[PDB]
Amino acid sequence: MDKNELVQKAKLAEQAERYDDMAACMKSVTEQGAELSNEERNLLSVAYKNVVGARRSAWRVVSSIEQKTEGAAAAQQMAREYREKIETELRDICNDVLSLLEKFLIPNASQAESKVFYLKMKGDYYRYLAEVAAGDDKKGIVDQSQQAYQEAFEISAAAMQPTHPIRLGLALNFSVFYYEILNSPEKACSLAKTAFDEAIAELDTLSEESYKDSTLIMQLLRDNLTLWTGGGGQRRCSLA
Amino acid sequence: MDKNELVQKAKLAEQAERYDDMAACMKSVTEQGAELSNEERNLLSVAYKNVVGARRSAWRVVSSIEQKTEGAAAAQQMAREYREKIETELRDICNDVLSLLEKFLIPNASQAESKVFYLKMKGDYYRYLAEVAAGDDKKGIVDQSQQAYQEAFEISAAAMQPTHPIRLGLALNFSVFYYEILNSPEKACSLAKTAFDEAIAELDTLSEESYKDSTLIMQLLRDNLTLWTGGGGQRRCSLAS
Lengths: 240, 241
Prior knowledge:
- The structure is a homodimer.
- The relative contact order of chain A is 0.07.
- Chain A has helices at 3-16, 19-31, 38-67, 73-108, 112-132, 135-159, 165-181, 185-200, 211-228.
- Helix content of chain A is 79%, strand content 0%.
- Chain A starts with a helix and ends in a 12-residue tail after the last helix.
- At the A-B interface, helix 1, helix 3 and helix 4 of A face helix 1, helix 3 and helix 4 of B.
- Chain A: Residues 65-92 form a coiled coil.
- Chain A: Belongs to the 14-3-3 family.
């Protein structure tokens, strides 16, 4: 009922790996209308990442079974209808988060850091709707994702150092969006490479608080770059 | 809706890792009242293992937090009430399985193999109720677990070879019951060691079909035995240590 009780209940849930409970608690906290702390916004984000993630995983498994069925009309319709059921759940979860973002989180965000966090998150949840959208719907959904990420990118680039984990994490997810939603390998690689290179150039700007997150996201950016540029498998390096 | 459809739905759910769906489908199959195939009984078992397992995990985490807060009345009540909520879910899942076992699976089992499987499973689900039972009902719950395992043990010892994976898996779980529920490490070790040694003495009774299952369960029995009798040695063994 009280904000701190709901937060303590959310952290309990998180320990128990009961992400529905964790999400329901943090949704209630968000709905009380006060600006979330860093800790609370992280709890919300982790909870819904897990809730939506379970459906995304399931969706890819069942979608793949649907396709790798030629010849069984009955088997294929069953896979199809289960995919559609999972898709409905996925859409409902995304719409819950996107509505929290629109009504509470984005309007109340008093700092550039938190505005970027939430705009990134809006980009993410429209990207998840984009992963399962067809047809005319899809282009509208894709455009919402891109505009959210783009606004995040611009605020971030003006307010935040290149090693800031939120700026780096935005670059990672926006690059993935270019690669797999807009089907642009070269734009995805330019975005990820630029973010990696700018951060490498200023590792003294790291603090103790965020260096682990920043360097971890940097590694993920470079991994994607390797995957997308067909790199790797060269002869091992000794010092050249 | 048809049995084969429900089974195909269960396998889909399994692939999606949607164990509630998988369990719902296999519960419906069980309720049609015909004897389950080996495949169907495995699907049922895997589904409910996952459904109950999520609560078991959660229950141990939250129960531990409840104890490791001897100070904080507010924190205590919240952990306690959350433990209780998880416990209620756990009990309802156990009661669902135990009812299917009592009403359909045990009575219809026409082979010793399947009778042992289900009596073991009844042993297991009463054991999971025993893990969370406090006070006056606990002794009754513990005794139901033990009688189920014991009847399984006797049928198994009469009808199945010592290398049969179901006989081995029963010995594994019944030894755990002795160790953890009856706090009887000596009996738990004796049961596990006997089952291991009896299988070693009749390795010709392995079939090509399930030797991989048998030898893996043998390894698990000996791992428990090592854990319970105070860990691995220092000092690597060469031949004739």
